[PDB]
Amino acid sequence: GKIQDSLSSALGKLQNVVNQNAQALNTLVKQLSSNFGAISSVLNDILSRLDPPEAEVQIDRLITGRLQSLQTYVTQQLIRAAEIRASANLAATKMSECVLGQSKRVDFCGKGYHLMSFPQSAPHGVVFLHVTYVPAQEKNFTTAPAICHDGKAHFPREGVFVSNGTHWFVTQRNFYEPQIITTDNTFVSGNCDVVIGIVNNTVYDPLQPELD
């Protein structure tokens, strides 16, 4: 609902390519009224007050100037089209990678974590609406890399060990959701004297009580 307000109330990149092309086409026509060193700018005026041997010299001065101006127009259009081409090549890649997929590239389909994208057509281009996830409202906790228990070192399978001040849990790294540390969400490797930062805490076995 806010995209609609912010636009209804920004398309400068599309306006600039229209303006540049019109400014060049006008400069092309406004050159049809320069002498380039001749008696006038009209061929019906050199063909009316000059005999054919003298009007050749004056017509050539116009021909040279007008050819120069047309060829300048055609060079600057090649250079402007090579730039529009790269923009369209980027738009074609964003349509593939943000609209028909989910991208992992950072800051390619918005700012945040890309969820999805929607295309909309514009006069000579395309608008992408990028939907991203942004995390909010953070707290600090204290962490450890591993937990020592029974002389073994335990590491989280897919999370982080955190402490609310007195107790130790596992969360997932992007959203706070604490769990009891068990042998189902941790794994073991080694003894607890080579890691630096290990803390002492109990790792709960689910079978051990339940069975008994």
């Binding site: 400069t27 406004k30 050159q31 009224s33 320069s34 002498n35 380039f36 060193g37 100037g65 101006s69 300048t72 600057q76 950072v106 800051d107 700012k111 945040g112 974590y113 942004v134 995390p135 909010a136 953070e138 600090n140 962490t143 890399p145 591993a146 070192a153 590491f155 982080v160 790294r173 490797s189 080694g190 080579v194 890691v195 630096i196 930062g197």
Partner: protein, 168 residues
């Protein structure tokens, strides 16, 4: 300046050149567009950060040593040691050179903030608010991203930090 390069002072030249139309207005527009694009190039590469982040006064980074690439407080430019090495290795007839909008003090200040964001928050500051994490644990998250299990980092921390330091 098209007129001052061509004619140049003389006045018999200016009235004759006035007969060519807008050839000189086009050239000045072309050169001005180029100069405006050069500042946008630099804004797009370097001003990729919301805040100007600072490193804490300690340097307890798990045995990793970033001193050759952090800024040097005893300098007017506040560049780093490697940025100082890199900077020691690289009026007319209407011609003029404009200065860039950003000083390179400003550019060095953008780069040091990008560096302190990475060393202190990993990749979280590039997607939102910077969330601190200890450097050894961030290194262990990154070992997971290349498919190595994360005790391989914690059991080899000193060796890995020495190899980083020698490569730097």
């Amino acid at each position: 300046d098209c007129t001052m390069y061509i004619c140049g002072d003389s006045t018999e030249c200016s009235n004759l050149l006035l007969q060519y139309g807008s050839f000189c207005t086009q050239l000045n527009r072309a050169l001005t567009g180029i100069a405006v694009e050069q500042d946008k190039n630099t804004q797009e590469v370097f001003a990729q950060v919301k805040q100007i982040y600072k490193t804490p006064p300690i340097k307890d980074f798990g045995g990793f040593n970033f001193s050759q690439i952090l800024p040097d407080p005893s300098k007017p430019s506040k560049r780093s040691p490697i940025e100082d090495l890199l900077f020691n290795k690289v009026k007319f007839n209407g011609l003029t050179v404009l200065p860039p909008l950003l000083t390179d003090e400003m550019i060095a200040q953008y780069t040091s903030a990008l560096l302190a964001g990475t060393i202190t928050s990993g990749w979280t500051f590039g997607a939102g608010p910077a969330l601190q994490i200890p450097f050894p644990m961030q290194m262990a998250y990154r070992f997971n991203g290349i498919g190595v299990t994360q005790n391989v980092l914690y059991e080899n921390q000193k060796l890995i930090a020495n190899q980083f330091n020698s490569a730097i």
